[PDB]
Amino acid sequence: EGDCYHSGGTIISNLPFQNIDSRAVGKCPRYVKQRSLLLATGMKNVPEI
Amino acid sequence: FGAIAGFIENGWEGLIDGWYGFRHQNAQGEGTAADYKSTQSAIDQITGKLNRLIEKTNQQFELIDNEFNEVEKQIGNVINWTRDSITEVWSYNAELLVAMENQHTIDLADSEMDKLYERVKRQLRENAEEDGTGCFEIFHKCDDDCMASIRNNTYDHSKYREEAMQNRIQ
Amino acid sequence: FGAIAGFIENGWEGLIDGWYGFRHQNAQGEGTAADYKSTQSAIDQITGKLNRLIEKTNQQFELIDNEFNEVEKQIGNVINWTRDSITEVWSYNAELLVAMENQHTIDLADSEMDKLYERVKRQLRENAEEDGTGCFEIFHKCDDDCMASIRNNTYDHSKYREEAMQNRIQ
Amino acid sequence: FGAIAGFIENGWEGLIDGWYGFRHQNAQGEGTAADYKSTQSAIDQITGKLNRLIEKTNQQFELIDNEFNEVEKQIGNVINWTRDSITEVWSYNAELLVAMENQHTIDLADSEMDKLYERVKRQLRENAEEDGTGCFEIFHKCDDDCMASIRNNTYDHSKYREEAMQNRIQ
Amino acid sequence: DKICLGHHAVSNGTKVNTLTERGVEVVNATETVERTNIPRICSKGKRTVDLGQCGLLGTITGPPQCDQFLEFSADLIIERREGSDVCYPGKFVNEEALRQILRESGG
Numbered sequence: 330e331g332d333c334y335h336s337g338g339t340i341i342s343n344l345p346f347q348n349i350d351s352r353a354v355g356k357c358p359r360y361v362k363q364r365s366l367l368l369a370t371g372m373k374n375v376p377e378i
Numbered sequence: 379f380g381a382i383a384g385f386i387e388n389g390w391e392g393l394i395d396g397w398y399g400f401r402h403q404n405a406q407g408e409g410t411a412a413d414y415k416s417t418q419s420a421i422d423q424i425t426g427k428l429n430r431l432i433e434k435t436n437q438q439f440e441l442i443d444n445e446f447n448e449v450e451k452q453i454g455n456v457i458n459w460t461r462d463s464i465t466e467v468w469s470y471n472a473e474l475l476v477a478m479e480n481q482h483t484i485d486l487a488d489s490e491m492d493k494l495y496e497r498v499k500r501q502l503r504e505n506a507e508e509d510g511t512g513c514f515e516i517f518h519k520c521d522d523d524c525m526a527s528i529r530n531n532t533y534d535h536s537k538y539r540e541e542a543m544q545n546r547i548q
Numbered sequence: 549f550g551a552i553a554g555f556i557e558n559g560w561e562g563l564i565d566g567w568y569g570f571r572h573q574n575a576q577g578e579g580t581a582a583d584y585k586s587t588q589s590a591i592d593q594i595t596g597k598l599n600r601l602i603e604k605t606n607q608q609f610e611l612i613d614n615e616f617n618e619v620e621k622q623i624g625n626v627i628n629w630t631r632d633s634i635t636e637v638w639s640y641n642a643e644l645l646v647a648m649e650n651q652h653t654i655d656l657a658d659s660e661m662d663k664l665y666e667r668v669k670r671q672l673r674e675n676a677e678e679d680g681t682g683c684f685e686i687f688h689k690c691d692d693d694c695m696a697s698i699r700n701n702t703y704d705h706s707k708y709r710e711e712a713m714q715n716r717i718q
Numbered sequence: 719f720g721a722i723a724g725f726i727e728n729g730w731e732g733l734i735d736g737w738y739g740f741r742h743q744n745a746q747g748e749g750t751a752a753d754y755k756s757t758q759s760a761i762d763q764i765t766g767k768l769n770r771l772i773e774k775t776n777q778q779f780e781l782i783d784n785e786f787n788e789v790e791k792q793i794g795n796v797i798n799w800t801r802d803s804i805t806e807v808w809s810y811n812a813e814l815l816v817a818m819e820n821q822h823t824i825d826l827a828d829s830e831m832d833k834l835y836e837r838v839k840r841q842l843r844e845n846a847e848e849d850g851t852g853c854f855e856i857f858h859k860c861d862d863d864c865m866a867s868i869r870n871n872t873y874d875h876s877k878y879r880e881e882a883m884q885n886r887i888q
Numbered sequence: 889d890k891i892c893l894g895h896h897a898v899s900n901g902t903k904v905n906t907l908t909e910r911g912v913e914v915v916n917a918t919e920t921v922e923r924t925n926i927p928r929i930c931s932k933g934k935r936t937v938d939l940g941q942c943g944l945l946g947t948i949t950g951p952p953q954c955d956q957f958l959e960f961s962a963d964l965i966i967e968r969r970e971g972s973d974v975c976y977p978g979k980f981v982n983e984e985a986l987r988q989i990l991r992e993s994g995g
C-alpha cells in the first residue's frame with residue numbers, strides 16, 4: 330500500500346523530506362537537495378574523561 | 379545553560395536506565411542510581427517533535443511533465459524553473475527546520491539539568507555546599523537510606539539541620 | 549527555566565492588576581500586591597510580536613484564472629500546481645511561524661520569573677533562605693512598611709543585617 | 719538571562735582586548751583585565767553563523783523572460799506572478815532568518831555571562847557574598863597575585879577558607 | 889560524604905547540525921530526508937490497469953492493441969516507454985493535454 334510515485338518505483342516514508350525524484354507525484358513529502366539530514370532523538374554527549 | 383559540557387566534566391556511560399541519574403558516596407560505598415522524572419520529561423519532548431513532522435499532507439498534485447513523449451521546450455524551462463526553485467525552498471527549510479529542531483533539542487538537556495540541580499539545592503537547603511565539578515559536599519552523615527529520601531523528594535531539611543550547620547562552619 | 553510550572557506550584561487568580569505580583573505574611577496578615585516592571589516588560593514583548601505580523605505587503609498580484617469563462621486545461625494543472633504549492637508553503641510557515649512565536653512566548657515568562665527571583669535574592673542578601681515552594685523564609689521582623697521597601701528596591705541589606713544572621717544560624 | 723542589561727548596570731568601553739573582562743580593587747588599586755575563554759567561545763559562535771550563510775547553491779537557473787523582444791502578455795502575468803511571489807517568500811525568510819539569527823545572537827551573551835558568574839561563584843565557594851550590581855564582596859585580603867589565581871582557575875577555596883568565614887559573619 | 893548529579897553519554901555516535909556549529913555528536917539520532925526507494929508500484933485498495941504498448945490516447949481511437957480498454961474501468965493508470973497512440977502514422981494535436989485529463993478520468 331502506498332501514496333507516492335515516480336518513474337522508478339514507490340516512495341514510502343513518514344519523513345517530511347526526500348531526496349529521490351523531483352517529479353514524484355501524489356500525497357508526498359517535499360523534495361530536498363541534501364541527501365540526508367539527521368535529527369537527534371537524544372541529548373548532548375560528553376565522552377567520559 | 380552550562381550544565382552539560384560546562385561545569386559537569388562529563389556523563390556517565392553506565393547509566394542505561396535513564397538519560398539522567400544519581401551517583402553518591404558515604405561510609406558505605408558508591409552506587410549509580412537514576413531519576414525517572416528528569417529522564418522522562420526529556421523523552422516526552424524528543425518524541426513530541428517526532429509526532430509533528432510525521433503529520434503529512436492531504437493535498438495531492440498531478441504529473442505535469444513527460445519523460446516519454448516530451449512536452450514543449452519554452453515551457454520545460456519554466457516548469458523546470460518553478461520546480462527547481464521549490465526544490466531550493468524545501469531544501470532551505472529542511473536546512474532550517476532540521477537545523478533548528480536539533481539546535482533546540484540539546485538545550486532541553488541543560489534546562490532539565492539546571493532544574494534537577496537547583497532543586498536538590500533547595501531540599502538540602504542550608505545543609506550542604508557546592509564544590510566545583512557539580513556535586514554537593516555533605517558534611518554530615520547520610521547513608522543509603524538517607525540519600526533515597528532526597529531522591530524521591532521526602533527529605534526533610536529541619537531533620538538534619540543542626541548537624542551540617544555545625545560541621546560546615548567548623 | 550523552571551519557574552512557571554516548575555518549582556512554583558501555581559499562579560494567583562486574584563492578581564488582576566498584573567501578570568506578576570507579591571504576596572506576603574507577617575505579624576499583621578496577608579496581602580496580594582503586584583509588580584509593575586515585571587508585568588510591564590512582558591506586556592512590551594507580547595505586543596511587539598503583534599506589531600510585526602501586522603506589517604503587510606505592498607506587492608499587488610492579478611487574477612490570472614477564470615471561474616466564468618474558463619481557461620485551458622493543460623495550464624490549469626500548472627497554475628493549480630503553483631498555487632496549490634504556495635498554499636502548501638505559507639501553510640508551512642504559519643505552521644512554523646505561529647508554532648514558534650508561541651513557543652518563544654511562554655519562555656519569556658520563565659526568564660522574567662528568574663529575573664524577579666534572583667534579584668530579591670540579592671537585596672535581602674545574607675538575611676533570608678529559600679524553603680521550597682518559591683518563597684524566602686524571613687527569620688526577622690518585617691512588617692507592612694518593611695516589605696514595601698523590598699518592592700521598590702530601596703531596602704537596605706546592612707539595615708537588618710545582624711538580626712537575621714542571629715536568628716538564621718540559631 | 720538578565721545578565722547584560724539586567725543586573726549589570728553596564729559595559730566597559732575600555733576593554734579592547736575582549737568582549738568579556740575582569741575589573742578588581744584592593745589595597746593596591748584598580749585594573750581592567752580580560753577573559754580569553756569567555757570572549758573566545760562567543761567569537762566562535764558569531765562567525766559560525768557567518769560560515770553558514772556563505773554556503774551558496776549549485777543550482778543554476780536560465781533567463782526565461784525578455785526585456786528586448788518581449789514575450790506574450792498572458793504569460794508575463796504568470797511569470798511575473800511566480801517570480802513576484804518567490805520574491806515575497808525569500809523576503810519573508812530573510813525577514814525571518816535574519817530577524818532570528820540576530821535574536822539568537824544577543825542571548826548567547828547572557829548565557830556566556832551567567833556561565834562566568836556562576837563559576838567564580840563556585841571557586842570562591844563560601845568565602846564571598848554578592849552585593850547587587852554584579853560583584854563579589856570580598857571580606858578578606860586578596861591582592862594582585864591572589865586575584866589572578868581566580869582568573870586562571872587555580873584559586874583554592876580551602877586556602878583562604880577560615881578568614882572570610884570570620885570576617886563575613888562578623 | 890558527597891552527593892552528585894550527572895547525564896548520560898556514549899562513544900558510538902553519529903553527528904548532527906545546528907545553527908552555530910556543524911558536526912556535533914549526540915545520543916540517538918533520526919533521519920529526515922528519505923533515501924530508500926521501493927522500485928515497484930504499490931496498489932492496494934484501488935482498481936488498476938496497465939497499457940504497456942497502448943498509449944493513453946490509444947483507448948480513444950483504439951488501434952488493434954487497445955481493444956479491451958475501449959471501456960476500461962480503473963482508479964489508476966500506468967504509462968510505458970512503448971505506448972503508441974497510433975498505428976497509421978500520425979500525431980494528435982494537443983495530445984499531452986488529453987493525457988492529464990485522461991490521467992484523472994477513472995475510465
Ligand SMILES: *[C@@H]1O[C@H](CO)[C@@H](O)[C@H](O)[C@H]1NC(C)=O
Pocket residue numbers: 370916917918
Ligand atoms: C533511538 O531513536 C529511535 C527513533 O526515535 C528509536 O526507535 C530507538 O528505540 C531509540 N534508541 C534508544 C536506545 O532509545
